Design an enzyme around this catalytic site. Sequence first.
Site, PDB file in Angstrom:
ATOM      1  CG  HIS A 163      38.610  38.937  43.394  1.00 46.48           C
ATOM      2  ND1 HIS A 163      40.001  39.115  43.570  1.00 46.48           N
ATOM      3  CD2 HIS A 163      38.057  38.461  44.515  1.00 46.48           C
ATOM      4  CE1 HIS A 163      40.297  38.732  44.870  1.00 46.48           C
ATOM      5  NE2 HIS A 163      39.088  38.340  45.479  1.00 46.48           N
ATOM      6  CD  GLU A 166      39.922  41.203  40.329  1.00 48.27           C
ATOM      7  OE1 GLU A 166      40.470  40.177  39.892  1.00 48.27           O
ATOM      8  OE2 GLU A 166      40.082  41.587  41.514  1.00 48.27           O
ATOM      9  NE  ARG A 221      38.371  42.233  46.355  1.00 49.84           N
ATOM     10  CZ  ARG A 221      39.516  41.648  46.672  1.00 49.84           C
ATOM     11  NH1 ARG A 221      39.657  40.977  47.807  1.00 49.84           N
ATOM     12  NH2 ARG A 221      40.513  41.827  45.827  1.00 49.84           N
ATOM     13  CG  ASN A 238      42.874  35.037  46.222  1.00 48.45           C
ATOM     14  OD1 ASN A 238      43.172  33.856  46.134  1.00 48.45           O
ATOM     15  ND2 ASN A 238      43.660  36.037  45.956  1.00 48.45           N
ATOM     16  NE  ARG A 239      42.958  38.676  51.529  1.00 46.91           N
ATOM     17  CZ  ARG A 239      43.177  38.962  50.246  1.00 46.91           C
ATOM     18  NH1 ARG A 239      43.014  38.056  49.283  1.00 46.91           N
ATOM     19  NH2 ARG A 239      43.567  40.151  49.909  1.00 46.91           N
ATOM     20  CG  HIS A 290      43.392  38.024  40.709  1.00 42.41           C
ATOM     21  ND1 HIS A 290      42.415  38.127  41.647  1.00 42.41           N
ATOM     22  CD2 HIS A 290      43.970  36.807  40.819  1.00 42.41           C
ATOM     23  CE1 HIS A 290      42.356  36.897  42.336  1.00 42.41           C
ATOM     24  NE2 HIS A 290      43.345  36.096  41.829  1.00 42.41           N
ATOM     25  CB  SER A 291      42.721  43.133  36.428  1.00 43.32           C
ATOM     26  OG  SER A 291      41.365  43.418  36.720  1.00 43.32           O
ATOM     27  CD  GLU A 364      46.670  40.783  41.024  1.00 46.03           C
ATOM     28  OE1 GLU A 364      45.716  41.481  40.630  1.00 46.03           O
ATOM     29  OE2 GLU A 364      46.556  39.875  41.892  1.00 46.03           O
TER      30      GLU A 364
END
Length: 402
Positions: A163, A166, A221, A238-239, A290-291, A364
Amino acid sequence: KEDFVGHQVLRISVDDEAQVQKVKELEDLEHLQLDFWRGPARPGFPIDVRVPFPSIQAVKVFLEAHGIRYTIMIEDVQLLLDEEQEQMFASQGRARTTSTFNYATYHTLEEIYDFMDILVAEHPALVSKLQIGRSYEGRPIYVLKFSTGGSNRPAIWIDSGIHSREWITQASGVWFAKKITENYGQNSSFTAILDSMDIFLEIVTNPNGFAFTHSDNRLWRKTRSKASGSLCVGSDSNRNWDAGFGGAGASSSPCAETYHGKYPNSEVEVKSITDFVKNNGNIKAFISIHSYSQLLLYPYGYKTQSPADKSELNQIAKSAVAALKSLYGTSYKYGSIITVIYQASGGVIDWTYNQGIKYSFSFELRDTGRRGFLLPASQIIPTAQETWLALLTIMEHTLNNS
Ligand SMILES: CC(C)[C@H](N)C(=O)O
Ligand SMILES: [Zn+2]
């Protein structure tokens, strides 16, 4: 460029389920153009949302009309942008070597790709630069391979930056790649890991996105695939995986930030990985980074039913997070995605774990909301450093438990 002048980021509290349901009604008011940093899940779980300047009254009034409490975490997002831009300007250096690269500033796509070529050239016998594909805008997708030999030795995959917004993840991915070529041979323990295993590290897992957050939209993103029928671009990477694809937690609206794509593995940047994994086959641990929110997560996202290896995963996660915290005090939480952040269908690690990659973890990173994605560059090195302690604990476990 897009500007974020006078855009605010609100932290919404929800005390019960009816409040949680009202916030996800607001989420359906498309023309508010609300950007949910951390969406609605449960009471007592914090909902972060960036609301654009025009929409701020509409959101505040809706919230008070229902007696839902909110607080302003960031009163103007553009100021954080200006601070970031200001320090990259001041840090604008000239890395001909990795020992003189500035790890404490954010970099552009080119400068990071440069870094990979200078790294493989400085340590040709350890790191290699594998291209596993090309993105929608034709940028090459690169993976670093760290290896001391063998044929198809058990490997450990880390990716960062799926993403694009991030930026702490791509920055930490670059620090880790220096780190490994630093501690190999000097750290007895880490040396034993690479003597037995391969490490694959993909730093810019969404290159089109990453470049777009430098060119046009910081807060972008998704991917940049242009879709059939819309003014609307991208799918949430990430979907897009085939684990619970199209299930609750992913949007079917192409304009949504959490839009799944037309079919599972429709994005090149995802299908490259799926083919890499399915062609490699000896990948033992899979960590996607991620974050933000300071979480260490494991399957599942799409479903409440527990992963079969729950006790073990929870123990690794328990050990790792404790190693991370021992450096700087930074407090993490852990557990399965669906119980610790929210339900979300079509994630990476739900897929990899269902492909038998037992040690499938998702981080995260920092922080927990005061800067969010606009994390101060002075925290890039502490963040990388502490998460390396956790990433080691997982690697050691993979080594030990063959
Ligand atoms: C689902 C979760 C694992 C991730 N932070 C996402 O929102 O894409
Ligand atoms: Zn993310």
